[PDB]
Ligand SMILES: NC(=O)c1ccc[n+]([C@@H]2O[C@H](COP(=O)([O-])OP(=O)(O)OC[C@H]3O[C@@H](n4cnc5c(N)ncnc54)[C@H](O)[C@@H]3O)[C@@H](O)[C@H]2O)c1
């Protein structure tokens with residue numbers, strides 16, 4: 001089986017590439033390195049089962065070529081920066097709706113049999129049912145990013161039914177670990193690297209969300225993928241997150257602890273009710289009963305995930 | 316109130332334009348006449364309260380210009396042909412996702428306060444709960460058209476929250492009536508005008524869906540709009556359909572009755588289990604409890620709606 005991994009030179013994408021290569025798949029990565037890096041996958045360059053394609057998925061010919069001789073696609077290429085939605089929604093539209101559409105047009109007339117998509121908890125919006133289940137509705141995303149992720153999901157479903165392939169949609173919580181160049185942990189580490197006396201924390205520090213270490217995330221994506229392949233569902237929806245959640249204040253405390261620092265916390269107060277930025281969901285915790293029915297469970301909770309992530313990053 | 320109506324020269328759009336003009340709104344229509352027609356709105360041309368812009372919403376400059384000095388937008392512009400999804404999905408993507416994205420970027424830099432959007436029951440896909448309520452999930456559209464409608468909804472919600480305007484999303488069932496140049500009734504009438512002894516029926520004839528006459532639909536869109544303006548919600552979701560449903564076979568029988576014909580029925584058998592085409596939902600019936608709590612109710616049921624539409628279209632054809 002050949003599997004294409006868009007965004008495979010990124011954080012989640014590079015870890016999933018590691019896993020796919022170790023399990024013996026033929027892996028083709030398509031990445032424009034706008035955010036990713038060859039350092040994330042240099043261990044695999046030159047492997048007789050590995051191909052790298054430096055390309056922007058806006059380029060429709062590149063995408064058509066990438067899906068050639070591919071039996072499965074893992075579509076992780078995206079701009080995952082919620083914060084930019086208020087200032088640059090077109091960027092999010094291009095990196096979440098447009099290139100997904102391009103992928104689907106290419107997949108349409110191809111031998112691609114399976115399409116796996118890393119969606120986001122942000123599709124649930126400010127969810128009123130917590131833990132949020134896969135069947136929560138109406139879906140009312142509050143950010144351009146979450147809206148774009150939901151749009152991608154919808155297109156994937158329609159194309160899967162119209163053009164006879166199968167789609168696995170996995171709505172991930174906040175995923176953290178080594179190689180990430182986005183997110184609160186990364187920014188706190190750099191902030192304290194620049195000034196260890198004072199740390200600016202966006203919002204009111206109470207934003208509370210479920211964090212999943214990348215190890216558990218790849219394990220989950222793979223067990224879900226396997227179970228999906230063995231089923232008949234044309235399109236299936238799974239949450240992937242942790243059992244618990246944790247606040248931004250506590251994350252700041254862990255980041256400080258691990259760096260043997262003692263900054264003053266300076267909260268900005270945020271916007272729209274203590275949010276870090278327009279569209280920042282304040283409370284997120286996904287239900288993972290459906291995924292647990294595959295034999296998957298987080299080996300770490302959110303606190304352990306955060307602490308391991310900080311230590312990994314510092315090395 | 317100044318309102319822009321995209322797709323206002325089309326089927327639903329022109330009737331909504333009529334209603335807005337009669338109520339004294341200042342109406343601006345944006346339509347590229349790809350499906351619509353000047354004849355649908357010619358009664359209003361030259362009225363000091365009516366402006367028409369023949370423009371393609373693919374052009375972002377046209378749309379930016381269109382939303383200027385507008386307090387509300389009714390976004391009805393789209394290509395509504397589910398059937399084409401298998402052969403030209405790109406067209407659907409452009410006329411349901413892309414132009415909606417452009418509209419939202421234009422609204423972002425504008426004084427528009429309200430956005431009303433005609434979404435579709437197809438966003439529910441082959442729903443397992445019938446009557447289907449607004450909070451049914453997971454949403455799993457089976458057509459490129461339904462997927463595009465759902466994507467548009469999602470973008471509308473995200474933009475509404477990020478950029479602080481209010482959005483009313485109305486998921487319509489099958490809407491029928493005068494001025495329609497799409498749908499099973501139009502096609503059956505044309506089929507029998509070309510050969511009145513034989514009617515080809517796509518699928519197995521058991522496709523069963525809820526039909527709403529356009530009169531009831533405009534009344535409903537207006538009651539929802541009014542209540543929404545008076546409400547608090549940032550984004551709201553309403554189904555708009557009938558209480559009942561009806562099969563394609565019965566629609567063919569009504570069409571035949573009204574045409575004083577009795578043709579041989581030729582079912583194609585369809586695909587994916589009797590569907591008319593890839594993505595054709597087989598069973599659709601929306602719950603309208605939420606809409607009913609605004610004081611709205613269909614004045615016609617699906618059978619009556621279909622019969623009124625057949626008679627309307629036939630008198631239209633004579634004229
Ligand atoms: N990290 C999280 O917490 C999280 C949570 C939920 C969902 N996701 C989703 O998981 C996927 C990966 O996220 P990540 O954290 O690894 O992000 P990342 O930025 O580290 O990786 C994404 C990759 O996409 C590539 N890319 C971006 N635009 C591209 C384009 N136009 N053409 C080709 N390649 C392009 C980038 O270069 C990068 O390698 C995305 O779909 C993201 O939305 C991530």
Ligand SMILES: NC(=O)c1ccc[n+]([C@@H]2O[C@H](COP(=O)([O-])OP(=O)(O)OC[C@H]3O[C@@H](n4cnc5c(N)ncnc54)[C@H](O)[C@@H]3O)[C@@H](O)[C@H]2O)c1
Nearest residue numbers: 322325326327347348349350351372392393433487489490
């Ligand atoms: N008729 C139904 O049963 C039904 C049901 C549910 C939802 N809807 C929705 O209601 C709306 C109107 O449907 P309708 O039956 O009146 O269709 P229609 O084709 O009669 O009207 C749509 C209008 O959009 C215009 N248009 C298309 N592409 C355009 C573009 N790029 N720029 C500008 N204008 C463009 C067409 O010229 C036409 O005038 C659509 O959003 C449709 O999806 C219709």
Ligand SMILES: C[C@@H]1O[C@H](OP(=O)(O)OP(=O)(O)OC[C@H]2O[C@@H](n3cnc4c(=O)[nH]c(N)nc43)[C@H](O)[C@@H]2O)[C@@H](O)[C@H](O)[C@@H]1O
Nearest residue numbers: 080082120121122173174183184187201202207248276280
């Ligand atoms: C579901 C996933 O949600 C994830 O969003 P998202 O909660 O912002 O993920 P983070 O960017 O890690 O932010 C987590 C929380 O920390 C707050 N925060 C406080 N200070 C900072 C800071 O300096 N930087 C950052 N980045 N956050 C900060 C942030 O507003 C939010 O409440 C996405 O990364 C994924 O793509 C996906 O959408």
Ligand SMILES: C[C@@H]1O[C@H](OP(=O)(O)OP(=O)(O)OC[C@H]2O[C@@H](n3cnc4c(=O)[nH]c(N)nc43)[C@H](O)[C@@H]2O)[C@@H](O)[C@H](O)[C@@H]1O
Nearest residue numbers: 395435436437487488489498499502516517522563591595
């Ligand atoms: C919810 C609404 O659903 C509506 O879809 P949709 O049921 O296909 O609406 P129609 O195109 O009217 O098709 C209604 C039913 O009639 C069947 N049918 C049988 N023979 C024919 C034929 O010759 N022509 C046509 N056209 N249909 C035919 C068709 O497959 C479907 O089962 C959309 O038009 C709206 O935009 C909206 O999405």
